[PDB]
Each structure stands twice: as structure tokens, then as C-alpha cells.
Amino acid sequence: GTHRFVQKVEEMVQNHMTYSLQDVGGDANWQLVVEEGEMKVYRREVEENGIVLDPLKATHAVKGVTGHEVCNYFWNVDVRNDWETTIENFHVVETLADNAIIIYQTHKRVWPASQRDVLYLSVIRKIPALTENDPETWIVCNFSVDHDSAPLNNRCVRAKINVAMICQTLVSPPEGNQEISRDNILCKITYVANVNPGGWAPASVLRAVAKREYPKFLKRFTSYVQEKTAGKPILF
Numbered sequence: 001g002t003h004r005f006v007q008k009v010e011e012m013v014q015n016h017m018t019y020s021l022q023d024v025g026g027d028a029n030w031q032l033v034v035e036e037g038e039m040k041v042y043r044r045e046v047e048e049n050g051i052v053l054d055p056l057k058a059t060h061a062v063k064g065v066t067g068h069e070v071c072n073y074f075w076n077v078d079v080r081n082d083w084e085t086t087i088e089n090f091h092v093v094e095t096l097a098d099n100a101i102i103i104y105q106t107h108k109r110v111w112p113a114s115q116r117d118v119l120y121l122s123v124i125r126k127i128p129a130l131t132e133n134d135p136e137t138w139i140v141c142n143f144s145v146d147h148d149s150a151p152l153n154n155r156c157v158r159a160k161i162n163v164a165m166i167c168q169t170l171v172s173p174p175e176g177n178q179e180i181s182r183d184n185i186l187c188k189i190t191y192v193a194n195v196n197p198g199g200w201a202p203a204s205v206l207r208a209v210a211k212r213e214y215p216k217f218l219k220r221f222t223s224y225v226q227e228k229t230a231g232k233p234i235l236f
């Protein structure tokens with residue numbers, strides 16, 4: 001694209017493709033904090049200046065949906081209020097391109113602390129596969145940016161985020177005369193969130209809230225995509 005954030009977008013996407021896809025199950029810096037079905041949520045305990053920064057990584061596998069579909073739903077602001085439960089208000093600050101926008105939103109007070117807001121560029125991209133034997137990758141990157149129309153608030157502490165939802169479709173076509181159905185596709189998801197709360201709060205509580213809220217979102221959101229796509233032609 002030609003918008004002013006193209007280089008930053010490419011950098012963020014590249015960093016996610018190399019660092020975020022790395023296997024974390026046998027990485028002792030990480031702890032498996034939540035497991036349920038195909039869902040696993042891991043976190044790395046990190047603080048700077050007493051502020052909790054814990055990188056979060058979740059993996060999931062969702063039957064019957066494609067990575068394109070999952071990423072479309074996650075990115076599309078027109079369905080945001082259908083699945084998101086942690087937001088108070090949001091609006092689009094600017095539209096940069098057909099696949100890239102800047103969003104301002106305030107969050108419900110889930111932490112024992114002041115309300116947080118956030119101002120982020122949200123971009124959906126396809127990373128082509130090197131071979132037809134591999135899956136294409138779809139990724140939505142949400143990362144903080146500044147904008148003149150959304151300066152610091154008087155009432156809210158400005159959090160900073162670097163989040164990616166990265167998805168690949170696996171297909172297992174049926175053995176004979178049948179056409180591929182949704183019974184034959186599975187979406188592998190890696191979701192990474194690095195959130196800087198923008199000020200101090202008790203780590204024990206922030207960690208409990210993350211352990212509760214991320215798996216709640218992932219189940220609700222993935223269920224939503226399953227419901228909304230059920231019975232429709234497959235969007236690879």
C-alpha cells in the first residue's frame with residue numbers, strides 16, 4: 001500500500017511470522033496456564049519497573065472454518081460488538097487502506113485500577129505459501145500508534161499493545177465422490193498479545209484477569225466464527 005504506516009506494518013508482520021510462530025510448549029520461559037480442548041494459553045512472566053508486561057500466546061485448532069474467515073471476522077469492525085465483551089466504546093479514527101484502519105477504544109474496568117484506553121492500527125494481510133503443499137497464512141496485527149485526532153485522555157490510562165491473530169487452514173479432502181465440506185477443514189490459530197498496562201497494578205490480579213479473559217474471548221470468538229460460517233461456501 002501507499003499509506004504512511006506500510007513499513008511499520010511489514011516489520012510487525014515479519015516479526016510475528018518469525019518470533020510469534022515459534023513453538024512454546026517445550027520452552028521453559030513459558031508456562032501453560034490454560035488448557036481446554038484444542039485450546040492452550042501460555043504466558044511468560046515479565047515486568048519492567050514493577051509494571052506487568054507478561055507476553056501471552058494461545059494456540060487453538062477450530063474445525064469447520066478457514067484462516068481467511070477467522071481473520072476476516074477478527075478484523076471486521078462491523079461484527080466487533082457481536083463477540084467482544086471487554087470494550088466500553090470504540091470508533092474508527094482513520095481508514096488507511098482497504099485492509100488497514102486505526103481504532104480508538106476504551107475498555108471496561110477489568111483491572112483494580114483506572115480505566116484503560118488504546119489506539120491501534122489494525123491490519124489484515126495474507127502471507128503467500130512458498131509451495132502448494134503448505135498453508136497460506138492470514139494474519140491480523142493490532143499494534144499501537146499515535147494519532148492527532150486521539151490524544152491522551154484525562155480520564156484513561158493509555159495502554160500500548162502488540163497483538164497478532166495468525167491462522168492457517170489445513171484441509172483433508174474426502175476419499176471419493178464427495179465434495180469438500182466444512183467437515184474437511186481445520187483452522188490452526190496462534191494468537192499473541194503483548195499488552196503494556198501503562199501504569200502499575202497488582203500483578204497477581206492482572207495475571208488472574210488474563211487467565212480468565214483470554215480463554216473466554218478465544219472460545220466465544222471462535223464459536224462465533226463457527227456459527228456465522230456454518231453451511232456457507234468455504235472461503236479459503
Ligand SMILES: CCCCCCCCCCCCCCC(=O)N[C@@H](CO)C[C@@H](O)c1ccccc1
Nearest residue numbers: 084086107116118142159163193195213214217
Ligand atoms: C489494552 C487495554 C487493556 C485493558 C484490557 C485488559 C486485558 C483484558 C484481556 C482482553 C482479552 C481479549 C482481547 C481481544 C482482542 O484481541 N481485542 C481486539 C479487538 O477489540 C483489540 C485487541 O487486539 C486487544 C488485545 C488485548 C487487549 C486489548 C485489546
